[PDB]
């Protein structure tokens, strides 16, 4: 996350971190329930074997709430392709259930029509993760969050060098130096409504980080709500 603020105690409890064999984070995820994590399908190509860490805010210390979980089943959307980045979504079933506690809790999955008419029409959403703090730097050792305005879809398409499909949406800033970045992909985009945070996107891709005239591109979770529900029942 470029710009934004640290997540303070309890503020981003649905954040998950995919960690490789070296115990290093490479992608984020969102806790949906005691057994399921939402992430991006492209993240599945960044590590041969990985586990999921939850409840972490500082990768350098041990605040006692951290828990590592092995993945039992990887459910990758059958239409994802590196060529278009369309259908960039996957769900992970864990081997053991997550124990909710301080800094560990699920984000709510909304209903499709209501999410499109009421959540995605709000001014902003919140993106979070342990990704780079500048396009050229190292991953953050601290979990960060950033308020990101929803971007008009026409403007989004005009700004992009690649096709923005119906399974994608734009969020962020035209020139302000704030955006998700490398290491944040797969992580949560949530929208607050009356003090309740709903899953609205998955950090997917961007032409660099916080570039002028470019925005962050998110998987549209509302397009996959039935697919997610089906994935969680098996």
């Amino acid at each position: 996350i470029v710009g934004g603020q640290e997540c303070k105690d309890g503020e981003c409890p649905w954040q998950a971190l995919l960690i490789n064999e070296e115990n290093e984070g490479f992608c984020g995820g969102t806790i949906l329930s005691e057994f399921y994590i939402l992430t991006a399908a492209h993240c599945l190509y960044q590590a041969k074997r990985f586990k999921v860490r939850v409840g972490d805010r500082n990768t350098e210390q041990e605040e006692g709430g951290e828990a590592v979980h092995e993945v039992e089943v990887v459910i990758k959307h059958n239409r994802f392709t590196k060529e278009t980045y369309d259908f960039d979504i996957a769900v992970l079933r864990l081997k053991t259930p997550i124990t909710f506690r301080m800094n560990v809790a699920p984000a709510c999955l909304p209903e499709r029509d209501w999410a499109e008419s009421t959540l995605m029409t709000q001014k902003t959403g919140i993106v979070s993760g342990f990704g780079r703090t500048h396009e050229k730097g190292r991953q953050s050792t601290r979990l960060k969050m950033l308020e990101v305005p929803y971007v008009d879809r026409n403007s989004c398409k005009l700004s992009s060098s690649f096709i923005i499909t119906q399974n994608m949406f734009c969020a962020g800033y035209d020139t302000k130096q704030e955006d998700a970045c490398q290491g944040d992909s797969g992580g949560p985009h949530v929208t607050r409504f009356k003090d309740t945070y709903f899953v609205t996107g998955i950090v997917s891709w961007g032409e660099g980080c916080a570039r002028k005239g470019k925005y962050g591109i998110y998987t549209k979770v509302t397009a996959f709500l039935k697919w997610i529900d089906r994935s969680m029942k098996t």
Binding site: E11, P13, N103, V104, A105, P106, A107, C108, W114
Partner: protein, 52 residues
């Protein structure tokens, strides 16, 4: 603006318009309150709440 378009039909969470009236509902792990508008967590660590 009317019904769900007017302040979310006074619902805490989901709002649907059925037979020209507002119908509220809630996410999994919440139960609709007796007023049919508020959402009450059924147990601990309900989805979407910061753990403060």
């Amino acid at each position: 603006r009317k019904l769900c378009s007017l302040d979310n039909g006074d619902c805490d969470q989901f709002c649907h318009e059925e037979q020209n009236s507002v119908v509220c509902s809630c996410a999994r792990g919440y139960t609709l309150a007796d007023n049919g508008k508020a959402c009450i967590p059924t147990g601990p660590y309900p989805c979407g709440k910061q753990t403060l």
